[PDB]
Write a protein that binds this ligand. Structure first.
Ligand code: AH4
Ligand code: K
Ligand code: K
Ligand code: ZN
Length: 358
């Protein structure tokens, strides 16, 4: 009986950009990742989980009725009207297939979480597009329509109990502004993001992503931002952040389910990120999170734009979930000075809330 689930459906390739056919969020992102799983003989080792559509009642766990109704109406618009609607948001393109593809991405992740929680599988991966982490309650943003990861947390609570403890780890190179805002006054969902910041000048261009935003109300302490400035970061800085911050806070919270907002745009070779994390580095981050929540872990694709880099990086994560031995990293070398400044600023902000840090 396979201990790892996998979901993929080629219908999610139909969303496309009719005015700019080389735009980086390409249909072949998901088909290239699936083909590499066949070449490495990983697909036959997994249990295949089918895709489905999310329902409109499920979308209302996080989104307004007006936002649901506007995106739904684009299914039948003519080209001139699709171009006008898209230009009303920050960095969005739309075709007649976009609404259906965003529904399939969300429902694929609901079926995966249900298989994990009922014990049919121990853990799982989801090869899905368009992405989710910039979408807000009332608007679309940054290539994203509905917030797939935030919806999956609320779905899991609805079928078990309202206070089920969920951790979301966001290792995409950009800040997830929508996920932060949805859970900002909530102590049942812990949000932890690592991201390129540059004093507010990198997308999405807001001071909401700095280390001093810690949560609101009864949610004070349950929002953790790790921002990078002035440096091309890689394996040494990401391992240091996990050892001093991510893993001590996670163990004290003691989650019952772990969701990864797993973009691969911090990887060596990415044309938007400019950073240097390796496939062996992503394998070590995956193996550390497998020690939490009695092993209940779901990996969800977000961004990432070098086709060879994302195919090798996500395949190594699946190999770790199946139980293979982790590969060795490069030799030890000094951290960059600005990265130690960032880690010290986060420790000073969260020490009042977490005894494992003081
Ligand atoms: O991932 C996400 C979603 C992120 C949304 C970002 C919106 C602002 N837009 C860019 O950030 C951006 C940066 N770069 C480039 N391209 C480029 C690519 C293909 C064709 C032409 C140009 C580029 C390449 C090399 C050197 C200079 C520019 N395109 C867009 N969230 O997690
Ligand atoms: K992030
Ligand atoms: K929170
Ligand atoms: Zn990204």
């Amino acid at each position: 009986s396979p201990i790892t689930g996998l979901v993929y459906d080629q219908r999610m390739m139909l969303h496309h950009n009719m005015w700019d056919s080389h735009h980086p969020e390409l249909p072949q992102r998901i088909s290239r990742i699936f083909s590499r799983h066949e070449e490495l003989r990983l697909l036959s080792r997994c249990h295949r989980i089918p895709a489905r559509l999310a329902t409109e009642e499920e979308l209302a766990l996080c989104h307004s009725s007006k936002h649901i109704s506007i995106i739904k109406s684009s299914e039948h618009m003519k080209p001139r009207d699709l171009n006008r609607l898209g230009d009303e948001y920050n960095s969005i393109f739309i075709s007649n297939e976009s609404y259906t593809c965003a529904l399939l991405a969300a429902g694929s992740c609901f079926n995966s979480a249900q298989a994990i929680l009922t014990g049919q599988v121990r853990n799982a991966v989801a090869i899905v597009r368009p992405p989710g982490h910039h979408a807000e309650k009332d608007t679309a943003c940054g290539f994203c329509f509905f917030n797939t990861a935030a919806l999956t947390a609320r779905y899991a609570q609805s079928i078990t109990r309202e206070s089920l403890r969920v951790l979301i780890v966001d290792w995409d190179v950009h800040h997830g502004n929508g996920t932060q805002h949805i859970f900002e006054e909530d102590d049942s969902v812990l949000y932890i993001s690592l991201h390129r910041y540059e004093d507010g000048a990198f997308f999405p261009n807001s001071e909401d992503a700095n280390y001093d935003k810690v949560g609101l109300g009864k949610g004070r302490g349950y929002n953790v931002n790790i921002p990078w400035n002035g440096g091309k970061m890689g394996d040494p800085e990401y391992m240091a952040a996990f050892h001093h911050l991510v893993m001590p806070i996670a163990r004290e919270f003691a989650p019952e389910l772990v969701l990864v907002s797993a973009g691969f745009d911090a990887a060596r070779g990415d044309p938007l990120g400019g950073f240097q994390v390796t496939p062996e580095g992503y394998a070590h981050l995956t193996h550390q999170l497998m020690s939490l929540a009695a092993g209940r872990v779901l990996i969800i694709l977000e961004g990432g734009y070098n086709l060879t880099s994302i195919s090798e990086s996500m395949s190594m994560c699946t190999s770790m979930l199946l139980g293979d031995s982790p590969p060795s990293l490069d030799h030890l070398t000094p951290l960059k000075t600005s990265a130690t400044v960032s880690i010290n600023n986060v420790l000073r902000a969260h020490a009042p809330f977490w005894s494992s840090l003081r």
